[PDB]
Amino acid sequence: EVVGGGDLGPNVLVFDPSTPDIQGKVDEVFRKQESNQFGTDRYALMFKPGTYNDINAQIGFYTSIAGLGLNPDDTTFNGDVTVDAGWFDGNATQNFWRSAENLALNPVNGTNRWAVSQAAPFRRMHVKGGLNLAPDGYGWASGGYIADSKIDGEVGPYSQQQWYTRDSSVGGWGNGVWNMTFSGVEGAPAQSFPEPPYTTLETTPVSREKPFLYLDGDDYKVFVPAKRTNARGTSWGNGTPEGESLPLDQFYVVKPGATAETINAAVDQGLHLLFTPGVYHVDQPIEIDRANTVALGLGLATIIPDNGVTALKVGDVDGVKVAGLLVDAGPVNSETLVEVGSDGASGDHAANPTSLQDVFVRIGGAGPGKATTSIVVNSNDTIIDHTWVWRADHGEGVGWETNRADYGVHVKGDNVLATGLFVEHFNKYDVQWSGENGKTIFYQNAKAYDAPDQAAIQNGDIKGYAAYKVDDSVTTHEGWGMGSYCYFNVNPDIRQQHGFQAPVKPGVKFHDLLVVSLGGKGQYEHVINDIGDPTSGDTTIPSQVVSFP
Ligand SMILES: OC[C@H]1O[C@@H](O[C@@H]2[C@@H](O)[C@H](O[C@@H]3[C@@H](O)[C@H](O)O[C@H](CO)[C@H]3O)O[C@H](CO)[C@H]2O)[C@H](O)[C@@H](O)[C@@H]1O
Ligand SMILES: OC[C@H]1O[C@@H](O[C@@H]2[C@@H](O)[C@H](O[C@@H]3[C@@H](O)[C@H](O)O[C@H](CO)[C@H]3O)O[C@H](CO)[C@H]2O)[C@H](O)[C@@H](O)[C@@H]1O
């Protein structure tokens, strides 16, 4: 039984420098996906190596676009790969669930616009011009994530609240609103927080670039980049990154029809997983318990666990690479949605860690969804490089009970690294860290907006549950460039005692923390523990702590 390789299904639209009506055939997708925030259509747009002209690819919901060279410059657009905000009058605060990878862009007026909020990665791009992250106007925006990219000109966030860039090069960088964090960025502005609120690290401590599909002349393969310790700048500027290249014959090609049983029997049998674009329902976890297994998603491939099961269980193995998957809770509460490693997991994976990359969790919004904890990271050395774990605040099936989700991410492994951590709206602790020697570079949280009252969120004798808690038994932890925002629109008399909670210990340190009330809808009492000013006013002024402790 199981069979690697084959055609990639209807939802992977694959273009070359000759193909007909590329513009009309990219277009059509956009007019279908532009306002389709909670529909089940999914699309991947893939471009063969060469040069494309006259192209302006507006990217809507649940649309990935990428090149199929090894290097960004192998697939060049004279034109744009664009996100803006027309559907929502210029408000970019719901521009979610889309992606761009492995392309070079020569934008038509000199500037590519990528007006995105969360879960909208921009990886391995070469922009031969500037990159604007704001919508036409300077309406609300809440991004964002760039990795492994070279922007020849200026990145211009304008009204973007916050941003994370790693292992990249920019010609310059125009402005900082609340929290612009950089690690391993050539051309980043020097560290300057509080004002302007730039958090700048010379290197990312460990990174490994996300695997991606690409052509060898005409063989579908997947490139699996070689890990980089103390990374700075791009992996591909000096051509060939170290890395090995699985052929697609060694992947099971997931489509509708596939069962959890079938997907499991493939990883078992010795195949990797390529999820083609679609929404998949499963009645038991997808379990990845072979070392070095790549599970790569296309087109915002989405897994929904039925019957309260865990969607994804990774075993206690080295080297697994989960990349490009949206895990969408079912109506029936799952105790966990994603578990990396087993409970009581104990060995190390330093040389060849497991990673989650562009893994997105949603609880609610397309109908009710519920989970107790969304991601449990048990495995030591795991890298979490871009995640958005989101209890819905809008849509259908949202409400304090209707889409209850108490806990977002629980990190129990030791030496876990999060780079680009976005977690929002959980009824209790958005992030909890119980393991040793953890490190987070960039955090973005917003609290739950629908606590019906203060009693709903009493946390023992603390008011509210921290956005980011380090259990007081930890000895060793560090974070950089971290923010928590509140919008208790339902009951704006609520108080949130702090954004962050931790031990007061020599080795449990932070850098550049902030909390923000959005329009005076509730307030924070402090930034971390009992330290830092409360928020005040209705004018959305951040309260900050530069150091801790
Ligand atoms: O021609 C190059 C030029 O393309 C620009 O893309 C624009 C879109 O910004 C725009 O999308 C509109 C909304 O953002 C706007 O506010 O209102 C309506 C309603 O939805 C939208 O059309 O639409 C036109 C065409 O549809 C696009 O060309 C890029 O932003 C820009 O960077 C680029 O230079
Ligand atoms: O609800 C949609 C979406 O909202 C996101 O949070 C937004 C905030 O992004 C937004 O913040 C505004 C700032 O961008 C702007 O600069 O300042 C004004 C104040 O003058 C801010 O309000 O505020 C809205 C609420 O009005 C928030 O909901 C969430 O991150 C996201 O999860 C959510 O889906």
UniProtKB/Swiss-Prot annotation:
Q: Which GO terms describe its cellular component?
A: extracellular region
Per UniProt, subcellular location reads as: Secreted
Q: Which cysteines are joined by disulfide bonds?
A: none
What changing residue 118 to A does, per the record, is: 1300-fold decrease in catalytic efficiency
GO BP term, pick one: glucan catabolic process
Q: Into which family does the record put it? A: Belongs to the glycosyl hydrolase 55 family.
Keywords recorded for this protein, A-Z: Carbohydrate metabolism, Glycosidase, Hydrolase, Polysaccharide degradation, Secreted, Signal
Q: According to its UniProt entry, what is the function of this protein?
A: Exo-beta-1,3-glucanase that specifically hydrolyzes laminarin and laminarioligosaccharides, producing glucose and laminaribiose as end products.
**Which E.C. number(s) belong to this protein?**
3.2.1.58
Per its record, how is this protein called by name?
A: Exo-beta-1,3-glucanase
Q: How does activity depend on temperature?
A: Optimum temperature is 50 degrees Celsius. Maintains 70% or more of the maximal activity from 35 to 65 degrees Celsius.
Catalytic reactions of this protein: Successive hydrolysis of beta-D-glucose units from the non-reducing ends of (1->3)-beta-D-glucans, releasing alpha-glucose
UniProt organism field: Streptomyces sp. (strain SirexAA-E / ActE)
Annotated catalytic residues: 446 (proton donor)
